[PDB]
Design an enzyme around this catalytic site. Sequence first.
Site, PDB file in Angstrom:
ATOM      1  N   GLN A 121      20.380  43.288  66.041  1.00  0.00           N
ATOM      2  CA  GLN A 121      20.276  42.362  67.164  1.00  0.00           C
ATOM      3  C   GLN A 121      21.202  41.165  66.983  1.00  0.00           C
ATOM      4  OE1 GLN A 121      15.716  43.201  68.759  1.00  0.00           O
ATOM      5  NE2 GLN A 121      16.115  41.437  67.429  1.00  0.00           N
ATOM      6  N   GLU A 156      15.194  53.538  62.481  1.00  0.00           N
ATOM      7  CA  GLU A 156      14.416  53.807  63.680  1.00  0.00           C
ATOM      8  C   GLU A 156      15.307  53.534  64.881  1.00  0.00           C
ATOM      9  OE1 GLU A 156      13.047  50.381  64.555  1.00  0.00           O
ATOM     10  OE2 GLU A 156      11.911  50.770  66.392  1.00  0.00           O
ATOM     11  N   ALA A 165      11.227  51.957  57.516  1.00  0.00           N
ATOM     12  CA  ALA A 165      10.776  51.716  56.153  1.00  0.00           C
ATOM     13  C   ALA A 165       9.414  51.040  56.079  1.00  0.00           C
ATOM     14  CB  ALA A 165      11.806  50.865  55.401  1.00  0.00           C
ATOM     15  N   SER A 168      18.274  41.503  57.281  1.00  0.00           N
ATOM     16  CA  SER A 168      17.201  40.580  56.950  1.00  0.00           C
ATOM     17  C   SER A 168      16.775  40.769  55.499  1.00  0.00           C
ATOM     18  CB  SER A 168      15.998  40.784  57.877  1.00  0.00           C
ATOM     19  OG  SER A 168      15.494  42.109  57.788  1.00  0.00           O
ATOM     20  N   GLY A 224      12.604  42.738  56.101  1.00  0.00           N
ATOM     21  CA  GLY A 224      12.444  44.087  56.603  1.00  0.00           C
ATOM     22  C   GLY A 224      12.620  45.129  55.515  1.00  0.00           C
ATOM     23  N   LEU A 264      39.089  37.528  53.572  1.00  0.00           N
ATOM     24  CA  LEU A 264      37.791  37.478  52.909  1.00  0.00           C
ATOM     25  C   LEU A 264      37.896  36.932  51.491  1.00  0.00           C
ATOM     26  CD1 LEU A 264      36.113  40.811  54.085  1.00  0.00           C
ATOM     27  CD2 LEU A 264      35.734  38.478  54.923  1.00  0.00           C
ATOM     28  N   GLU A 307      39.587  34.532  50.486  1.00  0.00           N
ATOM     29  CA  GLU A 307      39.655  33.075  50.497  1.00  0.00           C
ATOM     30  C   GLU A 307      38.271  32.446  50.585  1.00  0.00           C
ATOM     31  OE1 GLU A 307      42.793  31.728  52.926  1.00  0.00           O
ATOM     32  OE2 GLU A 307      42.254  29.599  52.829  1.00  0.00           O
TER      33      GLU A 307
END
Lengths: 438, 341, 423, 54
Positions: free
Chosen positions: A15, A71, A99, A140, A143, A252, A254
């Site tokens: 999301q 899911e 999970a 997250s 989760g 990346l 840096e």
Amino acid sequence: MRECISIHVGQAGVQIGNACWELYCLEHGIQPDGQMPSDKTIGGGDDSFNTFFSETGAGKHVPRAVFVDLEPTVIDEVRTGTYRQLFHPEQLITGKEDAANNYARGHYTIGKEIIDLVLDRIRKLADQCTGLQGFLVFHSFGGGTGSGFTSLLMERLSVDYGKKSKLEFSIYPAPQVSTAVVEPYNSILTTHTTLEHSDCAFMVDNEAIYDICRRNLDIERPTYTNLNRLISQIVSSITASLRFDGALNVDLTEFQTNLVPYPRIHFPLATYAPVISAEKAYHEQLSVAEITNACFEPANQMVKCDPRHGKYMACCLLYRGDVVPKDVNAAIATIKTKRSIQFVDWCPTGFKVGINYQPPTVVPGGDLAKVQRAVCMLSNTTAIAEAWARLDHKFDLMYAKRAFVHWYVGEGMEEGEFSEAREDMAALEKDYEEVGVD
Amino acid sequence: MYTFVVRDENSSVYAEVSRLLLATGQWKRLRKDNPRFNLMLGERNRLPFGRLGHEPGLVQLVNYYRGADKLCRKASLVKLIKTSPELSESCTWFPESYVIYPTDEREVFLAAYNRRREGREGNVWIAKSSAGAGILISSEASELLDFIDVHVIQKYLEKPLLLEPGHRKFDIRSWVLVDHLYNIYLYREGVLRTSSEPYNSANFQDKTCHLTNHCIQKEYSKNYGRYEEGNEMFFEEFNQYLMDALNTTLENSILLQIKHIIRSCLMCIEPAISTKHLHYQSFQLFGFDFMVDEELKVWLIEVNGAPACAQKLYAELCQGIVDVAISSVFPLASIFIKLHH
Amino acid sequence: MREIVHIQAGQCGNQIGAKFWEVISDEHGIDPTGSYHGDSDLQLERINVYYNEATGNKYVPRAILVDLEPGTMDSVRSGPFGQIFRPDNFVFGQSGAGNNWAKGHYTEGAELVDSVLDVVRKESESCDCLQGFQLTHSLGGGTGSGMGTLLISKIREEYPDRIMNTFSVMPSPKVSDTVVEPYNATLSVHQLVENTDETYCIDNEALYDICFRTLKLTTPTYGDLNHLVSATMSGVTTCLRFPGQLNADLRKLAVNMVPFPRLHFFMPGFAPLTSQYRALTVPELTQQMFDSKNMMAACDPRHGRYLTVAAIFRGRMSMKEVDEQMLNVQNKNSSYFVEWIPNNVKTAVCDIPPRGLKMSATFIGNSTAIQELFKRISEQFTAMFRRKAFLHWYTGEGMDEMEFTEAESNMNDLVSEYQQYQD
Amino acid sequence: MEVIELNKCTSGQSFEVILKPPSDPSLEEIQKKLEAAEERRKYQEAELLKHLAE
Ligand SMILES: Nc1nc2c(ncn2[C@@H]2O[C@H](COP(=O)(O)OP(=O)(O)OP(=O)(O)O)[C@@H](O)[C@H]2O)c(=O)[nH]1
Ligand SMILES: Nc1ncnc2c1ncn2[C@@H]1O[C@H](COP(=O)(O)OP(=O)(O)CP(=O)(O)O)[C@@H](O)[C@H]1O
Ligand SMILES: Nc1nc2c(ncn2[C@@H]2O[C@H](COP(=O)(O)OP(=O)(O)O)[C@@H](O)[C@H]2O)c(=O)[nH]1
Ligand SMILES: [Ca+2]
Ligand SMILES: [Ca+2]
Ligand SMILES: [Ca+2]
Ligand SMILES: [Mg+2]
Ligand SMILES: [Mg+2]
Ligand SMILES: [Mg+2]
């Protein structure tokens, strides 16, 4: 031009990723159908925005992204959302049963059955990169998928892409919106097995985003949509240098060079300002000094903590909008006298500044108002260790009684990994106190 | 109905504050490790400020200011006075002090020591530390350093104001309360901790007449409680003495400098410890100790972060803590002087 | 498409189960013939958790009706929503169980269990993602108690990686059919301790007291008792039947509610309980929801401590005010919540209220005070077992006194386990 | 304050301001742990089925 691949894991990562890529398109002028009128090089090119988008022969700009969830309900909404035309089916990977907020289930039981499919879909996008920088992993802590499957993915990515960098955008658990009592367990388990494999991680505490929404946006009961729109703004500020012309944090590597001198201590604190409610017609536009001063107010940080009682190892300022270097230095001089800013002895007391003239983009109809200028501060302060202490304390409370441990043991995980992961966090807290305290 | 926890069983001040809160019928004491509290009477060492202000729907308040140790430590206080422009090296109400380790200031402490040696002025210094009861009062630098082998050495006030009858020493303890808004409240009631032995400037080995500590006077002094009960002279008696003896008041001769010193110290560290925009609020009770020289000049000796009150004043002061510090945040159903700034 | 397979066994199991399908069928708009006639898409978004979609757009409950006598099941097939059940899912014998755990578990029930498992297997085979099972039954009788626990044991063996959930009616001398109910309940409780993940302890003693004291019913019948169970079952399953984030499926519910494998017996509560047009404010729902008089287990929560709590508010209300009141209950009575499980109180909200109410609240508590229920049964059991009273009904079916002694010890162990976490 | 490394372009500019000078496990090992966990699951399940068989 070196490409970057974004990986969104679990509900939170998916999301939040959906919100960021929406913001990216608005910023780069990419319509929901993948068309980019301003892009004159059809079907290819090595512009800055190409680090996040590929180009088909038909001129569609496809995000270099991969969505993974155990899911289908969350990724299914992306399959039928506003920007459904951007992604092709290979980019969206979903399972049957999630999970169940169980780290062991996402890492061992269910993750083992899908890890090879995800890695194969990631290899597809990698094969389309002339020079892959690395990956940006959204997920997250609490989760079961965000924590469990992410650590298994980070383990393997280091195996297949040893020379590539990996950055995290991690969501710290907050009871006001959390959904599982065991989220402290999952947070510490995933931090333990991911530490060696992450070069730089930006923690976002849902508590801080929640209060910022209620305080500065006048949202009584903020939702995930409110939280994610504000988060995608922060993420956009952090990745803008990778997507636009500039000289600060252009790759990346840096990020680790400017923010992480100590490898294990790779959790920079993010502060954003201003956050203005679009529900008010007129609001006095804040100045460079005012929004810069706000970068040292805990009320604006992505994680509530007190940087005054810690030490800095690096500090970047990312400005977007009407900002000239003269005003930044004038604001730093004032703040430097009033504020309590202490760097570690073995680090210079300074600020790396980056300015992009295009002011922040706001989702039409959202809650954030348009502003003339905004700033996001990335400061690696020992004060962020307060979040580890909070998490470790709750972990100790439940683990002393072995509460819920049977759920993890039942998935094949051994009880010894709990204390092993806790001792690792204990060492992490010790490192911070050594650097930032006397 | 408010809730609070107790994490310092050895706190005589807040043991009374706890008793008062319960006696209001509107405060409920929880277990020491229960997180759903409104007020924490925290411990002195390693109070977990990082875990405060993360309880949704709870206004949390603690009775200590994080970072206030910079003011309540011997070496911290010296370093804060020399290195802070608001106080500056030219601070005229703090004794010339130096920090010496057993950074270090050994070469600086000796530089000013030789200058006073040739100058023939009073060259008596005192070395103390934050782990004392043990102090050494010597006029030779070589004996001070050999004794230390962190410590701090400052000039010993050789010409102190001596109460009569007695020709004795003393010190002034001031209780100051700082609430969540950072209002500085100076308790009207002070106490003079006097030495019952005549001040002898010839020999510093007998520290009964030099150290005004309440414990040292009750163990090493034979005249304990002779002049005043418990070697404690309150402001009423001290004021009348200054009027009869020196034709002045306690407010004019001493209390103005004390209020000035309290403002300067607390205003200096305010940016570093203020909880104005913080997710939790702080207040704290401080104990300032002053020395008054023969010329009615006030000198700051140290600031105690966990002070105890005087017996007679425990009731009044503790009730005042609840009124301005606790009830101001959690209302229920003046004895202080506000030092404005 | 996380399907749940429902099973109701015995007289009590089928009479309560029938009311449950009558209640949730009304909430989802399904009529007695299986046709949908609702006005909100929230009714269908998760209709598949409990219903199968048939030909002609018909919704068929995924329910299996089991009994050793045809009596009660003939009443269901002739009841209001009797036509909505799948005829093939009626599995019944002819001899009965005579309120005898041995008959339902070892003799009469053993002869019929394979038939039930064949129906369960048919239902599970066509499930896209089977969550698990929910069983309604009483523990005081013979079929639901004796055969019900036999079914659970065989279901776990065939589906070891699925959640097992039960609504279990505990016997009470206040509402008692026969004197052997403590025997049957004690034997069943051990089966539940081993073979279920979630058991809602429904005490007929509490149901009677609520009907008599609160609802002001002088002569409560089983129908009155089943009104409470029917409304409670709808409340506790709200998060499973409507879109939501918290406790949205059986396993995530178990992970949030069961900190120790054997302590999975919950106290359910419901609010309001009116004897009726007055509006109920959010503060009022919360106080009643936590009041012992609204608990269905007949255990004083203030005698134990809450390991975990699941709250569900239904209706259009201030979700901000819900958060406020919930935080107020915990902060006001934090001593009754174990401190070594931080934030053990989760709250969900559902816009659709129950039939006839503007807003309601369902309480699901894992309290150590549930030991009072098991102690009660244990005392009644021992009162007869010390004299071997009525044992011949069971030894005549092949059982040995040793199996009773072991069931007795298993029960007291469970009581001791609750006591260790209350200190 | 010292300003250094000033880079400018059409879309912005960057620089640095100094206020003061200073004073992996192989795929084989991962496979073993993943399969070792699946083994402890199978063992726990076999014991349950043995229990149910009794
Ligand atoms: N900021 C933000 N946090 C979220 C969002 N979605 C979930 N979370 C947080 O993530 C935590 C739960 O993890 P999830 O991402 O929902 O779980 P998951 O990764 O899908 O793994 P599963 O257990 O298999 O479902 C909770 O603390 C939530 O508060 C989101 O959209 N935005
Ligand atoms: N520079 C100085 N000049 C004169 N006297 C001094 C002095 N420094 C300390 N003293 C004497 O030493 C006594 C106690 O010193 P100090 O306050 O440093 O130790 P302490 O922390 O153990 C007492 P407390 O904690 O109650 O304030 C005082 O009563 C004072 O009379
Ligand atoms: N709440 C409720 N309890 C019941 C009902 N019928 C029976 N009981 C209880 O269930 C127990 C008897 O079990 P029963 O279901 O009749 O036996 P079975 O048919 O062999 O399973 C007794 O304790 C009764 O109090 C009912 O309709 N509602
Ligand atoms: Ca192009
Ligand atoms: Ca690596
Ligand atoms: Ca037969
Ligand atoms: Mg999920
Ligand atoms: Mg002291
Ligand atoms: Mg019956």
